[PDB]
Design a protein around this ligand. Structure first.
Ligand SMILES: NC(=O)C1=CN([C@@H]2O[C@H](COP(=O)(O)OP(=O)(O)OC[C@H]3O[C@@H](n4cnc5c(N)ncnc54)[C@H](OP(=O)(O)O)[C@@H]3O)[C@@H](O)[C@H]2O)C=CC1
Ligand SMILES: CCCCCCCCCCCCCC(=O)SCCNC(=O)CCNC(=O)[C@@H](O)C(C)(C)COP(=O)(O)O
Ligand SMILES: [Zn+2]
Lengths: 86, 134, 114, 95, 208, 297, 126, 146
């Protein structure tokens, strides 16, 4: 029916999370201003691979690996998540 | 009423104020027909026809890692960055400060001993309150 | 990673010994049902033998299955020679034990065990 | 100092009595609940307080080596008597 | 230190140290350690390939003549990767002496049976099969000796629990003694008895 | 629900099942295996006994320490019945005789004593009451046994309206009087159809009727899976037993066909698979030894 | 040759005679035991221990005793290192969790700091 | 010393309301059936959840997944944290980000609107140890508590 929350898991230090870090340092603020009532949970952890969880209506969760992406690839995957709403 | 387990009665993840996830261990079992809490919710999900995809405590912790992976890295403080972005988001709505002074709800030792349901059910905490109120 | 064998150099000799032990148990089951005057059938005892062999079917170490063949030969020697009584033969059939709760919900109802 | 519950069951010196709806009373049906009727808490209250002229008294419970380990009891509090932690005999400084 | 202290026997200590040197240099292929305790008992710690050559030496050498096998023993020490410590206690009646021969195995490596050296070993290592699970290769009749006939597990392993996994009772429905999972009306009460203060500074292990 | 009667353990001998059972007639054939199956769960079992205490000795290994309480009772003494039932949460009635005695006829054993036990259990606040009738209980029956047992079923139903009444057909086991009767008779063959039920099936049905809250107020018919004619059943008994005390009421009951009651629930509605005779007739009749199975209908 | 090459993982679960319920549902805990804070002695914090998850203890109906159905309720194993305990748990098919050794960090102790000229670490009594 | 409250006032059996409106004891089957029959008749904002103070993360994600199967996001806590701005999206704006141990590294502590003596007594003990040994400067904005 629609998207309910977004979860972005990433590392603080790993290079595979680097573009994901480059997404949050630059493009997260206007993302949150564009989606004010959508919870976009950024969860940093020690050695995790980057990951984009999209929980939809009735508990359905899609799962996108963000490993070794640039900030533009994270932006395109996240806007595919925002525009899908499946 | 669904009788649940207390913290001494279940292996259970709690996260402190600094983000360090920790787990209790089972010291005793719950009394009577009381059960572990997620066991109750999972049994309810199976009765309701919306059965959740976990059966054991390790599978709950795999789900718990899927939602935020620092909840299963025990005795680890995961550093959280991005104070600048939260500060930029906090400058959007200018909420007004009230003129009421900052008063904590616990001013003296009297207000310390009874805060939750275990402390309010404690006869020792009741003797402590009676000893500090006299 | 270089260990000393027990009987089998690899898994093929080990499967050969497993297979001969299964042949010996299969031959012994009717005599065991007869002389212990068991209340089970020969088919039921052979199904129990097949169950006990398939319980260990995941093992890939030649020394472990050599010890399993050795222990199965010891159990067979205790069965052919009347060293077991009827009680020891019938301990493979957990008949007085009530069936355990299998699914999540009945284990939730009866107690705390996962 | 034994008493009786409304079920008719005797209460022990611990305070143990089964409830009315407790099934475990059936073990006493046709049999008896063995209680000891010499409650030690009542018998040590029957002993008189020993008036001594010292500030510190020693108690071994009587009989020397047949009693308890010898302990020393301070008697500086005039509000409270000095009680032996082993035998419960209590002492008072007479001044 | 006269009345309450055990008197030290330095003569037997020196003699057993010399004989331990003797055994270690006659048999360097298998001898790993030689030690003499403060109460003068000699231990020869050997490689398990030399069960037969060392024990046949001590049985048959003219300066050893350890003709009697007093005892054969396993010890389970789970923190070692070779958790089982096979212990031979030998008696020389000629030289009025005792020696201890120690070796090791894990769950899966067979130890060579010493029935060809001492026939006394025939039941003892059979007991080591029953209690610990150590297989003895080329044993004449290796089987259980002390446990019940359908007994699962090896009880003197330290990960085997004190009460077992099953218990017996007579069941009148099947007219038979049956085995069921063990339930105790009173659990065995585990006592944590160890003082947190060091007792023996002479046995202090070096720290990390 | 009181704290001492909450179930605990893994259902073994030292566990607590939460069942406090007073089993009248526990010293008989059904009571043997019922006290066995209750005591292996860790139930508190009250055994009121009429007989010599020696004759209760076999009930003593069946449970953990203090889990079987023996006490004297008399069938014509409501004080002893109240003394036996007032702590129990289930009362099972297994009082029966195949013959009438000098002091007890079929009306005493099947009408007076069950109505007394059910009335005293009702006025003592016992939650569950289980009564054992017979499948062929009928008011217009030819045997005095089945007539008085139908009358006693009616009186138990009307004085304990939530009683679980159970109809076994013909119970076979090691201590039965059905296969052991046919094996020691060495009466004839007629058009009588029987479906005998196995004793462990009956015991599992009784204990599932204790645990099921839906079994209150019901009437169950415990029958075997296979209906047999009487003649080839008796010939199968003489074939398994390697063969080439009675009364006329017992003869009327052997020549009474086991009726079919499809409207009543059975062992399958309590989760019990009815064991056929051919799996268990050897276990019964091995004692009588100094086989093609029987034809079903 | 007289030696074979087994590259498989060491697993003895089919040989130990342990029933399956007490292999795959138990959680071994590998840990250096915490010091009893009633005492200053540290000799009980030297070795690694393996225990299991505590199961149900209930009241005996006859005596009030603590009845259990857990065979592993009193099983405490001692190990010299963490890796020995991990190897023993993996060898026996036990799912385990490991807590790291908590050593007390080195403290800076100075008796003269009790009597400082200008710091708050002066003791008001002694 | 609050562990003796753990053996009083305890919920030991499932309770449901009877015909008189009183909580009576029942089985797990009946209680979970009466909850699940109402849960199946809910959807969206028809069902919500409040988490208490002593709830572990396993039951939290349990009830979150259960209410998300009903398409309910209304899972609340009793303690109010402001969701304005970033809210709970970034972990840093609701953590003790320095650490408990990082108090030993600080030289100025500003306490705002808190009585850490009773809210978090060993955090206050760490502040006192830094006060005593590191000459920590502590300031408080709030009522002058001890
Ligand atoms: N084939 C079967 O067994 C079937 C049996 N039933 C019914 O099931 C019930 C149990 O059967 P079952 O075990 O085989 O019968 P039993 O004859 O073996 O045992 C009956 C029990 O009732 C007791 N009892 C008998 N008469 C009296 C009395 N006057 N006062 C007190 N106690 C008495 C006996 O005690 P004691 O030892 O002291 O005499 C015994 O414990 C009976 O009601 C029977 O009619 C129903 C269908 C089939
Ligand atoms: C009356 C009751 C009597 C009970 C008798 C108990 C006897 C128990 C003996 C146990 C002996 C064993 O289990 S040894 C088997 C272990 N083997 C292995 O792990 C190797 C895998 N083996 C297999 O898969 C075996 O089926 C085969 C036949 C060897 C090969 O089959 P795969 O090919 O498809
Ligand atoms: Zn005294």
């Amino acid at each position: 029916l629609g998207l309910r929350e977004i979860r972005i898991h990433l590392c603080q230090r790993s290079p595979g999370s680097q573009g994901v870090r480059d997404f949050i340092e630059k493009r997260y603020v206007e993302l949150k201003k564009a989606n004010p009532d959508l919870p976009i949970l950024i969860r940093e952890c020690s050695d995790v691979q980057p990951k984009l969880w999209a929980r939809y209506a009735f508990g359905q969760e899609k799962n996108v690996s963000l490993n070794n992406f640039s900030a533009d690839q994270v932006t395109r995957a996240l806007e595919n998540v925002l525009s899908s709403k499946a | 009423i669904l009788p649940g387990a207390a913290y001494t009665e279940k292996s259970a993840t709690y996260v402190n104020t600094e983000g360090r996830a920790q787990q209790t261990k089972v010291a005793v079992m719950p009394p009577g027909l009381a059960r572990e809490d997620w066991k109750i919710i999972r049994a309810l999900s199976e009765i309701a026809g919306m059965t959740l995809p976990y059966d054991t405590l390790d599978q709950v912790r795999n789900r718990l890692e899927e939602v935020s992976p620092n909840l299963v890295r025990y005795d680890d403080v995961e550093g959280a960055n991005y104070f600048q972005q939260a500060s930029e988001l906090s400058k959007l709505v200018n909420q007004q400060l009230l003129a009421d002074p900052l008063v904590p709800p616990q001013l003296t030792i009297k207000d310390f001993y009874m805060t939750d349901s275990i402390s309010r059910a404690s006869q020792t905490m009741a003797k402590c309150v009676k000893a500090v109120t006299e | 990673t270089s260990v000393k064998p027990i009987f089998s150099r690899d898994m093929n000799e080990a499967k050969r010994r497993v297979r001969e032990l299964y042949r010996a148990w299969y031959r012994e089951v009717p005599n065991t049902v007869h002389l212990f005057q068991l209340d089970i059938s020969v088919k039921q005892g052979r199904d129990k033998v097949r169950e006990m062999f398939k319980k260990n079917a995941h093992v890939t170490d030649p020394r472990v299955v050599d010890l399993l063949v050795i222990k199965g030969k010891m159990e067979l020697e205790e069965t052919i020679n009347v060293w077991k009584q009827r009680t020891h033969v019938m301990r493979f059939f957990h008949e007085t034990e009530a069936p355990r709760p299998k699914d999540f919900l009945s284990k939730f109802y009866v107690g705390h065990d996962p | 100092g034994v008493r009786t519950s409304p079920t008719g069951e005797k209460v022990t010196h611990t305070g143990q009595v089964y409830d009315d709806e407790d099934y475990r009373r059936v073990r006493f049906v046709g049999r008896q609940k063995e209680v000891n009727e010499n409650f030690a808490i009542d018998l040590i209250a029957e002993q008189p307080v020993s008036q001594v002229g010292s500030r510190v008294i020693s108690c071994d419970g009587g009989g020397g080596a047949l009693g308890h380990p010898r302990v020393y009891i301070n008697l500086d509090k005039e509000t409270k008597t000095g009680t032996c932690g082993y035998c419960g005999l209590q002492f008072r400084q007479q001044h | 230190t006269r009345p309450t202290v055990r008197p030290r026997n330095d003569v037997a200590h020196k003699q057993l140290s010399a004989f331990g040197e003797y055994v270690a240099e006659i048999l360097p292929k298998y001898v790993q350690q030689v030690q003499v305790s403060c109460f003068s008992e000699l231990e020869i710690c050997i490689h398990p390939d030399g069960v037969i050559p060392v024990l046949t030496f001590l049985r048959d050498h003219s300066n050893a003549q350890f003709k009697s096998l007093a005892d054969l023993t396993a010890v389970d020490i789970p923190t070692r990767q070779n958790r089982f410590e096979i212990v031979y206690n030998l008696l020389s009646l000629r030289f009025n002496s005792r020696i201890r021969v120690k070796t090791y195995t894990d769950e899966l490596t067979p130890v060579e049976s010493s029935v060809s050296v001492y026939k006394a070993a025939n039941w003892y290592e059979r007991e080591i099969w029953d209690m610990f699970g150590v297989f003895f290769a080329n044993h004449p009749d290796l089987r259980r000796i002390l446990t019940d006939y359908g007994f699962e597990g090896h009880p003197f392993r330290k990960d085997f629990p004190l009460s077992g996994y099953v218990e017996l009772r007579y069941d009148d429905e099947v007219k038979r003694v049956v085995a069921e999972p063990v339930e105790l009306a009173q659990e065995f009460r585990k006592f944590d008895l160890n003082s947190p203060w060091e007792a023996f500074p002479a046995y202090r292990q070096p720290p990390e | 629900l009181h704290h001492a009667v909450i179930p605990h353990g893994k259902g073994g001998r030292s566990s607590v099942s939460g069942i406090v059972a007073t089993v009248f007639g526990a010293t008989g054939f059904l009571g043997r295996y019922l006290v066995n199956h209750l005591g292996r769960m860790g139930s508190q079992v009250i055994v009121p006994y009429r007989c010599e205490p020696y004759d209760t000795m076999h009930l003593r290994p069946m449970g953990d320490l203090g889990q079987i309480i023996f006490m004297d009772w008399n069938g014509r003494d409501k004080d002893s019945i109240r003394r036996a039932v007032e702590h129990s949460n289930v009362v099972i009635n297994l009082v029966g005789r195949e013959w009438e005695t000098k002091n007890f006829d079929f009306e005493d054993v099947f009408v007076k004593i069950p109505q007394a036990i059910a009335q005293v259990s009702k006025e003592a606040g016992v939650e569950k009451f289980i009564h054992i009738s017979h499948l062929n209980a009928d008011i217009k029956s030819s045997s005095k046994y089945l007539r008085n047992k139908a009358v006693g079923e009616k009186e138990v139903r009307e004085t304990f309206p939530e009683a679980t009444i159970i109809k076994p057909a013909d119970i076979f086991g090691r201590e039965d009087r059905f296969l052991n009767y046919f094996a020691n008779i060495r009466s004839l063959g007629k058009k009588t159809v029987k479906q005998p039920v196995y004793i462990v099936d009956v015991t599992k049905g009784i204990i599932n009727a204790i645990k099921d809250p839906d079994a209150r107020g019901k009437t169950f018919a415990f029958v075997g899976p296979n209906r047999y004619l009487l003649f080839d059943l008796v010939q199968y008994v003489f074939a398994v037993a390697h063969r080439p005390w009675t009364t006329r009421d017992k003869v009327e009951r052997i020549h009474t066909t086991d009726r079919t009651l499809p409207h009543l629930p059975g062992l399958e509605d309590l989760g019990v698979q009815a064991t056929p005779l051919e799996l268990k007739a050897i276990e019964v009749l091995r004692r009588h030894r100094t086989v093609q199975p029987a034809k079903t209908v | 040759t007289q030696l074979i090459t087994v590259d498989e993982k060491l697993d003895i679960t089919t040989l130990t005679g342990v029933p399956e319920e007490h292999i795959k549902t138990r959680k071994a805990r590998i840990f250096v035991p915490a010091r009893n804070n009633m005492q200053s002695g540290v000799n009980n914090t030297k070795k690694w221990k393996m225990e299991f998850d505590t199961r149900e203890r209930w009241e005996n109906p006859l005596m009030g005793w603590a009845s259990t159905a857990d065979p592993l309720s009193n099983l405490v194993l001692t190990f010299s290192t963490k890796e020995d305990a991990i190897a023993f748990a993996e060898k026996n098919g036990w799912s385990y969790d490991v807590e790291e050794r908590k050593v007390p960090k080195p403290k800076s102790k100075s008796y003269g700091a009790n009597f400082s000229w200008n710091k708050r670490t002066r003791v008001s009594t002694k | 010393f609050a562990y003796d409250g753990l053996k009083r006032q305890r919920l030991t059996e499932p309770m449901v309301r009877n015909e008189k409106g009183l909580l009576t004891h029942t089985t797990w089957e009946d209680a979970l059936s009466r909850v699940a029959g109402m849960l199946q008749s809910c959807q969206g904002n028809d069902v919500a959840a409040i988490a208490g103070g002593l709830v572990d993360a396993e039951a939290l994600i349990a009830l979150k997944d259960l209410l998300n199967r009903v398409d309910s996001d209304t899972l609340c806590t009793e303690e109010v944290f402001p969701t304005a701005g970033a809210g709970t999206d970034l972990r840093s704006n609701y953590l003790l980000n320095t650490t408990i141990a990082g108090v030993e590294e600080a030289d100025v502590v500003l306490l705002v609107g808190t009585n850490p003596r009773f809210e978090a007594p060993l955090f206050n003990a760490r502040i006192r140890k830094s006060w005593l040994h590191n000459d920590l400067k502590v300031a408080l904005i709030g009522s002058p508590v001890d």
